[PDB]
Each structure stands twice: as structure tokens, then as C-alpha cells.
Amino acid sequence: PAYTNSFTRGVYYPDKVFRSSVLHSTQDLFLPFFSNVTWFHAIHVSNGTKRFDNPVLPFNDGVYFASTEKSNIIRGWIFGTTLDSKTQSLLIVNNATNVVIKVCEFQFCNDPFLGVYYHKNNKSWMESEFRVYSSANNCTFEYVSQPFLMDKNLREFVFKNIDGYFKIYSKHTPINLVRDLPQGFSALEPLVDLPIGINITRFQTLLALHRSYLTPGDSSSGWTAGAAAYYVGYLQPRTFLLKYNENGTITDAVDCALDPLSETKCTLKSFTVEKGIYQTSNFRVQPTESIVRFPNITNLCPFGEVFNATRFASVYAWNRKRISNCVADYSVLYNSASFSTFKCYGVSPTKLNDLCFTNVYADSFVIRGDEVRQIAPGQTGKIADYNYKLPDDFTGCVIAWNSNNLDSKVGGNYNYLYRLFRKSNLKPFERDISTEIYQAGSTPCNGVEGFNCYFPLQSYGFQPTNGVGYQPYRVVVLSFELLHAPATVCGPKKSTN
Amino acid sequence: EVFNATRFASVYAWNRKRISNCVADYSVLYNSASFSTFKCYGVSPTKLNDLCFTNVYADSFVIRGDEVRQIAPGQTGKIADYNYKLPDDFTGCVIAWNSNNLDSKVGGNYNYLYRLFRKSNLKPFERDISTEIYQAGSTPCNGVEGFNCYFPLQSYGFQPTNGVGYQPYRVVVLSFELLHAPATVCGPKKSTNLVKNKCVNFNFNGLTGTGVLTESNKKFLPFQQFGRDIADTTDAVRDPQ
Amino acid sequence: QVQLQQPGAELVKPGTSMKLSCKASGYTFTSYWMHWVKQRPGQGLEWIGMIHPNSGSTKYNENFKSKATLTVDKSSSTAYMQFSSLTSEDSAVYYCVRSGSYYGTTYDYFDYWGQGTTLTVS
Amino acid sequence: TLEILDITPCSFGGVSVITPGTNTSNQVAVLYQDVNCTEVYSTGSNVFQTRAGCLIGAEHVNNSYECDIPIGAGICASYQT
Amino acid sequence: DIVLTQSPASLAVSLGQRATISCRASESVNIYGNSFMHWYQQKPGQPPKLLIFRASNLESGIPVRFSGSGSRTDFTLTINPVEADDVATYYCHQSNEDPFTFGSGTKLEI
Amino acid sequence: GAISSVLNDILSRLDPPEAEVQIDRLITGRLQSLQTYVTQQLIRAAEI
Amino acid sequence: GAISSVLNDILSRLDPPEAEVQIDRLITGRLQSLQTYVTQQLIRAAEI
Ligand SMILES: *[C@@H]1O[C@H](CO)[C@@H](O)[C@H](O)[C@H]1NC(C)=O
Ligand SMILES: *[C@@H]1O[C@H](CO)[C@@H](O)[C@H](O)[C@H]1NC(C)=O
Ligand SMILES: *[C@@H]1O[C@H](CO)[C@@H](O)[C@H](O)[C@H]1NC(C)=O
Ligand SMILES: *[C@@H]1O[C@H](CO)[C@@H](O)[C@H](O)[C@H]1NC(C)=O
Ligand SMILES: *[C@@H]1O[C@H](CO)[C@@H](O)[C@H](O)[C@H]1NC(C)=O
Ligand SMILES: *[C@@H]1O[C@H](CO)[C@@H](O)[C@H](O)[C@H]1NC(C)=O
């Protein structure tokens, strides 16, 4: 793709309002003056070898399509968001009889094209069949009129989508230029406005393919596609000072943003500006970034104390503490690598800082190392069922870390206990401080101990020699909830350098 | 068929249909007592006949009763912000009438949907039919419904026993725009003979001005209808007839 | 497990006000929330009122607000409800109700209910 | 931190072009009124600084000429070979 | 207040087959993510038995056959292996506000 | 701030009860513009 | 007459639809202040 200058082209009629000797300046989607326009060349013969290349060029809020070919090789265009059956697709077809603009939900083929055949008696290339879409569903609009594409000649078309309307402006002027857009000014009258009502993201040119191409032969004997020369530009929202002559034709225009001189013309609303200094605009330096600074978190929630402490409650007597009315920093909690287990089932731990929850709870308890996995949302386990239960729908963090140094020693930690036997599985987030013997059995023993009656609580054995399976791994379950009340505990307000 | 149709679409995907190349008698609509609310924002209900409009759009959908107020230029709400948003500078008239006996049955009528959750605000006069699951923000979720993510379409609860504010109210939003393009559909005001060189009151497709008409040598291109001057007051008009 | 005891059936004359309570076993009565409900066959269950046994306020539904007096006894783990101007339509089978919460301050779940006593005025 | 930060507003100024007659030429010189050239046609094109502002597009001349287009603060621009 | 309309009321489903019943409240029972809905197993002349005491929480000691689904006003119950004796009247209840209303009733038969 | 800048359109578009607010917007704006123009003309005429 | 003299707060603590009314009150007030200032400047500049 070789680029060429726009050279003050793409100027069309903004509104269907007559004006005579009026220097009316309006802002509209326009092709910027002196813009470097890509001369796409779709199919280039090698020997006559076919090289099919119809790229999906982006719409970019307007296309200044143009072609200098007098052979009328181009026949219609393709407009669509994704060019599939799901999305509504726009079709333009320019046959000899008329122009067909048809909009439906179209399942396009890999190569959308118009197939023509040569008839010996008629000696003309009539349309054999159309092969662009496989199916036509949810059809919305159709338009038929005299073909503008047919009848040296340079054909210009601006395609715009504004408020569900398709704007097409056509102008035809014969030129002798080989491959460059003329260094001249030509306004574009509104050919037709179409209430398509769909969004167009990419633009694809459609080319007529002859019977020689339609044959599976790699070489088209009767047709050559090397003349497929077309230009594609992109329109930008620039204010323009259009000049209407006595007939209402825009003989000339200036693009305000192109250079300070054109900004001067737009300011004075005159194409000829006398020598001097003119306050065209004001220079404003935009902010590079945003900085937010806020004081230290005075009411810092004591997560450091509760997480890092010497003495904790046991699992059966697990302590529930209310973390509220303070701002809590979970960034230090997440960044800390001291804890072996940092799992937040309800919410992603990474974004725990930004969210604000009305009420936060922390549970302190002690379980064996092998049974750390038992404390999990909707987990069936002895310790999980009996003393500490976690609900299926859980919004909180379960934090565990090695506690060999904190409390494990040669002396057994007989003070800590777990409920080996209980009548029923405990409800989630329920405290179980029970001294009941729980005799149960075939017959209640009614005593401290029995053959079938056992005291619920059994002493932990914590030893350094116990190893990974039996070392403490003291576990903390953090809890979150929302009670349809204003949040009083939340992450610290962000501070930037 | 715009108003007395058997079926009307839900708010999230409403029917926008063209009205053009006709004669429009808004008076028979206005005088009708079926329409409970006839608030015209950019126009007047009585004076709709005099005007002539380039394009007429009829947006029809079924909403709950209390939500009628929030379908208006510049009002916030559930329906207004996630389902159907009118522009702040809206020129048109909203027509609403009770439909409890029509589209609400003895059992729960649940075919009408409103998008309860959406990422952000709705732009004016745009239809979003996306059914992607909405994530609150705490945790990412897949397409399957989750604890934190919900299906965005929510069904209206319509029962005959519901009172005002909980009953379906058909709303037809007639949005009118004057783009200076040739007008297509407008009032039934009878055309009269054209008068030149004499001071007359002229109503050329709703300009409604007073002046003396003289034949002009200025040439108008076929697409464009009327000219303008510095004051942006009409300096030349092409006859409609 | 948790067992709540109710009379099998109660036959009374119209216009009589009486106390109905549930004995609580297997759980601490004070901590858990105390609610009440009545059943009428062929008609939906509809709630009565709320009291927290240890230092808790009381609320009732609007239709039956103050129609029946409701109290809680810390001893015997029983909550006593008293009628007022009992009628045939007021008669229904009443169920002892216990409520539980993950964090408190809300009614997350109802864990156990009693068998219920049938207030038949036949 | 117990520190005091003076807030002065971001630099702003009126972009004033210096153009000769449209028939005479199409080249322009741009004056950025009371703006330092640091935060500033593309930059680096014969940038010259004066009290009025950062004058871009015209090269400074040590020789003194009669005023044609008054820039301000004693600077005047002319279209000369 | 909040009214619950159980749909499709009484339902008949074959043994070991998908069964779906949904009751939609007049206004949503979920406050912020968490939902307050209770589904009950009331046999004739027997106390109601819990199935699902939250949006998706399932009571311990009860078969996992009952499943939780739904959001905001609309909550759906799924029973893929419907069993013989568990069929009875089903109630759904909203715990968000003080009216504390329950469902109408949902008869189930094989 | 009025819906349209031509009095004839708003006068044909809006009934007087709510038309009068838009006409008042236009009246205030055009009166401000005319007062500004007349003041500029008075100062310029003092100069002249 | 606007509920606040800094437009950022009214653009933040109100949603637009009723916010542009206060913005109009403030725009009219500030525009009147500039017209007064420029008129006094013109008269003072005529004196100077
Ligand atoms: C100008 O065109 C050349 C090629 O002709 C291209 O490389 C360059 O990017 C263009 N400049 C633009 C688009 O600003
Ligand atoms: C307008 O169109 C006429 C048509 O013949 C042409 O003669 C004339 O040169 C055009 N331009 C002007 C300014 O009249
Ligand atoms: C660890 O303990 C220290 C006590 O010096 C405390 O400041 C810190 O916050 C604790 N870490 C965590 C993650 O709580
Ligand atoms: C449909 O409703 C309109 C508006 O009330 C009415 O004019 C028309 O007569 C109705 N249709 C029939 C067939 O009555
Ligand atoms: C522009 O900024 C630089 C910063 O290094 C400073 O030295 C210079 O004095 C500034 N210009 C003026 C006119 O103050
Ligand atoms: C003007 O004189 C200064 C003196 O140092 C010199 O640096 C500068 O280059 C001169 N400029 C020209 C254009 O001669």
C-alpha cells in the first residue's frame, strides 16, 4: 500500500440548505486536508495470475473512497461490524440495470463478489448470479435507483454513519491523472441518505468478477484484475469553513486544524487574511497524571495484632472479634509471604483493598496440620463438621501459617482440644463451647467416661518431631458481609507518590 | 397499528419503526381519552397539526406504572438508565395508557424484560440487546451464573391485582426532528393556492412566516429544499406541491 | 440432636386465651432467635412475631400486631405466647421457630422448628 | 509529611499566529503568550523566547527592523528574505 | 410488603427427573449479593424440613439432591433425582424485611 | 437555551403556557444582546 | 443563585439533568459579571 496526499478533497455538502455568497463554517466529519491517503490495490496480476486481496479496511468514522478507473471494475461495497449472520450487514451492488442497496443479517462467504458472464449473441457482460451471502435473515431495508457507479472519469464517494443514517456523497469528474488524486477542489453533493440504523466498523470494497475468474482456473483468460486501483481515506472531526458560491456549490474550503494559517482563516471567517497577529486560540497544558494524598490511617484495624500474636483461642472455643468502624489495609495481608495458606473464596484477594464492606469478622482457632484443608466452604470433614463449619456461600479469607516456632515445643499442648464426638454437625459460623459429656451410645453412661460414652474434647499433641502432618498450622478465617447498611470498614484511600 | 397493535416489544429491545410519506392526524390521538399521559416536551399536543416534520419515529414498549415519569428528557432511574434513555434535548411527545387488561393476564405475565444490571449508563436512543452476565467487581466469573454475577434480563412482575405504579403502561415515544431535509409526513392542514407578489401568511411545511413571495432566479439543487441568510431565517423556499 | 416438644392436640372453647411454649433441648435457648408461626391446612403459613430471649426487642406483623401477647421465659427454655380475643379464624396450628445467623444482626437462616401444637376449637 | 507545597496553576497562554498577507505567503509564526518553551506547529522549529512568550516558527534576528506585526514586549515580526 | 407467588404451583414430575419450581417476590429479597430465601419440606401433619436456607446453602444431614439457583426475585429449585417419599408441600420465604411472608404451597407427585 | 432560535417555529410548536418560558429565554438573550449592542454603539458613538 | 459557586461540586453532587439548570444560573451570572467588567473597562478606557 502506497500513500498519497488527499490534496484538499473530501468536501461535501453538510446540510441540505441553500446558501449564496455565504462563508458558513461548521464542524463535521471531514477528510482532513493534505492527509496521506492509502492507495490500496486489491488484485494485482503477476502473466495474468490472480492475487485476490480485499482487506477489511476499518471504517474510521468515514471513508473517502475514490477510483480513476473508467472500466467500472468496482461494483459496490461492503459495510459491516463483523460480517457474520449474527450482525446486520450492509450491501451495495451496482449492476447495469440499477443500484441495489440491501441490508439484512447476512452470512457472508469468504469472497463476496458479483458473478458476470459473457454471452456471444448479446456481446455484453450480464450478471450471471450474485455470490456474496449464503443467507439473508432479518432483512430491514432495500433501495433501488439509477446506478451512480457507472456513468478518465474519477468517482468519489463519502460513506458516513450518523444517528443511524448512511450518508453517501457522489461526484464524478473526468481526470487524466495516472495514480494520484487531482490537485483540485470538487464538492460532493448528497447522493442519497439511508436510514440503515446499524453500526459499521470495517469497510471492504466489492469487485465484479468475470466468467473467466469464476472458473476454477488460476488464470482468467478473458478478464484482468490488474486495473483494480482505488483510494481509501479516513474522515476526522475537524471544523471546516465552507464557502458557497452564487449557485450554492462549495468552490473552496479550509480545514481549521491543518495549520495555524487555516486556524486564522477559521477565526476571521475569511480566506484572505491581512498581515497581522490574531489570537486564534489558547494554549492549555493538560495534567500529566492524577495524584491523591491522604493522611495515615488513624483508625487502623488491628489486623496485625490479631494475625500476629502469641496466644489464641482453641477451635472449639474459637474467638469471634468484630472489626468495624476502622479502615483496614489488606495490602500488607496479601503481600505477606509468612502465611502458608492465603485463600479468599468469596472475593479475589488481589482486589480486597478497594471494596468496602459494612462488617468484618475474624475467627481465631487451632486445628491440626493435616486437617487444615477441612476448613473450606462446604467441606465435609470431622473437624469441619463438628466444631468449626464454613458455609457453601462464603465471602471471606481463610488464612493459615506454620506455628512451630510460636507455640510448638517438647511439652504437649494439652490445653488445646478438638471435639472428637458431637451429636450433630455444627451450623456454619456457630460457637460450640460445650462441657456436656455427650454420652450417646446404646445407653447413656451418665458419667465422665464410658465404654460407648466419650468426652467430646480430645487433647492435641504438638511436638517438633510430629512433622508436617501434626505441627500446629494455626488457621485464621476472615469473614465479610454486607447488611444493606453504609460501609464503616474499608480499605485505605489510595495515596500516590 | 402503532398504538392498537396486539404485540409490543420489551424495553431492553424496543421497536423503532419509520414513519414517512403520509399525512399525520395527531389531533385524533390527542383528543382520545384512552391515553392517560400525553406530555409533549418539544411540541404542543394541539399545535402538532400545523407543523411539518422531516421524520417521525415511534418507539413503543411496555413498562411498569411508576416508571412512566422517568421516561422523560433528563430523568434518572432503573428503566431510564439501563433500559431506555431519552436525550436531554428531546423534541417529541410521550404517549402512555394503561394496559392492565390487555397485556397482563390472570397468571403472571412475564414476557416483558428489563435489563436490571449493566456496566454503565445508556446513551440516548440506542438499543442494547446484549445478554452477557454482569460482574459486580469483587471476583471474575465465567458465562455460567455465579454468586456475584447475575443474568442481566429481569422479568416484570405483572398481576391484575397490582395497583397503579405496578401495572403495565404501554408507552409510545413519538420522536420528531427537523433536519431541514424535505418533510415526508405531517398534519392534515389543507393546501391552498399559491400567492405571489402580495403580502401573505405562508406556511411552507411548517415555516409559518409572513412575507411577500416573489419568483427567484436562484437555482436550488434537487436534494436541498430551502435557503437561509445570515440571521438563519428562511430567505427562499421551494414549494412542496 | 435438638428436640422441641409440643402438645399433640388442644381442644378449647372459643374466646379462651392460653399460653403455648416449646421446651428447648440440645441447644442454648437464649442465644438463638425465637420466632412463631401458625399453619392452617389449605392456607399458606404466615409469620407471627419476634423476640430474642436474652435482652431482645419484640416486633409483630401488621395484621396481627398486639393481637396476641408474646413473651419468653429464660427458665425451662420456653417462650410463652398469650392470646387476646381468640376467634375461630384466629385458631391455627402453631409451630415453635428458631432462627440462626452467620454474624447476627440478620436472619440468615432458621435452623430448627418444633413439631407444633394444633389449636383446634372444635 | 509536614511540608508546604506552593500551588501555581498550569501554564496557559493565548496562541497568537503571526501571518503575512495570504496572497503574499502561507508561512506562519506562532506566539505562545507567556509560556515557557519547555512545556510546549511542531516544537523545535526555530524556537525563540521573549518576554511576551515562546515564539515558534520565526527565527530571531539580531538586526533591528521597523515594526510590522507587533509580537509584544518589544518583539516585532516581518516577512523578509 | 413482599408477596411470593409460587410457580407453577402444584407440579407433577416423574421419579428421577428434572423438577423446577420458582417463586418470584414482588420486590427483590437479595440486598447486596447475599440472598435471604428459605425452602421448606412440610409433610402432612409433620414439621417443615429445611432444604435451602439461603441463596445456595444446603442444610447438613440432608441429601444433596436438592440444588440452589436463582438471583434477585426469581429463585429456582432443581431436583434431578426426584425420590418417592420426599414429595410434599413446598414453601419459599423471604427473610429480608419484617413481613416475613412465606410461599403459597407447591404440591409434588410422581 | 431555548429549543429553537426562530420565534415563529416555537410559536407554532408550543402552546403559550409552556411556550412563554422559551420565548422568555429568547427575550432575555436577545435583550442582553441588544443591550450590549446599544452600549457598544453608545461608547463608539461617544468616540465618534 | 446556584447552590454552589464552584462548578465541580455541582457537576459531581448532582446528576446532569437538573445540574445544567444550576450551571445555567452560574453561566448567566458569570457572563453578566464579564459584561459588566468589559463595559466598565470600555468606559474607563474611553476616559484613559
Ligand atoms: C505520509 O505518507 C507516507 C507515505 O506516502 C507515510 O509513510 C506517512 O505515514 C504519511 N504521514 C502521515 C499519515 O501522517
Ligand atoms: C451557476 O450555474 C450556471 C449554469 O449555467 C453557470 O453558468 C454559472 O457559471 C454558475 N456559477 C455562477 C456563479 O453563476
Ligand atoms: C505481624 O506482626 C507485626 C507485629 O510486629 C504486625 O505489625 C504485622 O502487621 C503482622 N503482620 C500481619 C500480616 O498482620
Ligand atoms: C384502536 O385504538 C385506537 C385508539 O384508541 C382507536 O381509535 C381504534 O378505533 C382502535 N381500533 C379499533 C378496531 O377499534
Ligand atoms: C523556563 O524554564 C527553565 C527551566 O530550566 C528556566 O531555566 C527558565 O528561566 C524558564 N524561562 C523563563 C522565561 O523563566
Ligand atoms: C546574535 O548575537 C549573539 C551574541 O552572542 C549570537 O550568539 C547569536 O548567534 C546572534 N544571532 C544572529 C542571528 O546572528
Numbering used by the authors:
A (entry chain A): 26 to 71, 74 to 178, 187 to 532
B (entry chain B): 340 to 580
C (entry chain H): 1 to 9, 11 to 30, 35 to 59, 62 to 72, 74 to 111, 111A, 112B, 112A, ...
D (entry chain A): 581 to 620, 636 to 676
E (entry chain L): 1 to 31, 34 to 57, 65 to 72, 74 to 80, 83 to 109, 114 to 126
F (entry chain A), G (entry chain C): 971 to 1018
Q: What did the paper state?
A:
Here, we identified monoclonal antibodies (mAbs) capable of cross-reactive binding and neutralization of animal sarbecoviruses and SARS-CoV-2 variants by screening single mouse B cells secreting IgGs that bind two or more sarbecovirus RBDs. To deduce recognition and neutralization mechanisms, we used single-particle cryo-EM to solve structures of Fabs from the seven cross-reactive mAbs complexed with a SARS-CoV-2 6P spike trimer. Here, we characterized mouse mAbs elicited by mosaic (M8a mAbs) or homotypic (HSW mAbs) RBD-nanoparticles using both structural and functional analyses, showing that mosaic nanoparticles induce potently neutralizing antibodies that cross-react between animal sarbecoviruses and SARS-CoV-2 VOCs. Structural analyses revealed neutralization mechanisms, potentials for intra-spike trimer cross-linking by IgGs, and induced changes in trimer upon Fab binding.
Despite broad recognition of sarbecovirus RBDs, the HSW mAbs exhibited overall weaker neutralization potencies across the sarbecoviruses tested, with all IC50 values >10 μg/mL. To compare recognition properties with the M8a Fabs, we determined a cryo-EM structure of HSW-1 bound to WA1 spike at 3.1 Å resolution, revealing a single well-ordered Fab bound to a trimer with two “up” RBDs and one “down” RBD. The bound HSW-1 Fab interacted with two RBDs: one “up” RBD (1° RBD) and the adjacent “down” RBD (2° RBD). Interactions between HSW-1 and the 1° RBD were mediated by FWRH1, CDRH1, CDRH3, CDRL1, CDRL2, CDRL3, and FWRL2 and only by the HSW-1 light chain for the 2° RBD. Structural comparisons showed the epitope of HSW-1 overlapped somewhat with the binding epitopes of C118 (class 1/4) and CR3022 (class 4) and included mostly conserved residues. The class 4 and 1/4 epitopes of M8a-3, M8a-6, M8a-31, M8a-34, and HSW-1 were buried when RBDs adopted the “down” conformation but fully exposed in the “up” RBDs. In the present study, we found inter-protomer distances of 48–69 Å for trimers bound to M8a-3, M8a-6, M8a-31, M8a-34, and HSW-1, consistent with increased openness of class 1/4- and class 4-bound trimers. (H) HSW-1 Fab-WA1: open trimer conformation. We could not evaluate potentials for intra-spike crosslinking for HSW-1 or HSW-2 because either only one Fab was bound per spike (HSW-1) or the reconstructions showed Fab binding to dissociated S1 monomer (HSW-2). Corroborating this, the HSW-1-spike structure showed only one bound Fab per trimer compared with three bound Fabs per trimer in the structures of more potently neutralizing mAbs, and the HSW-2 Fab epitope was incompatible with binding to its RBD epitope on intact spike trimer, resulting in a trimer dissociation.
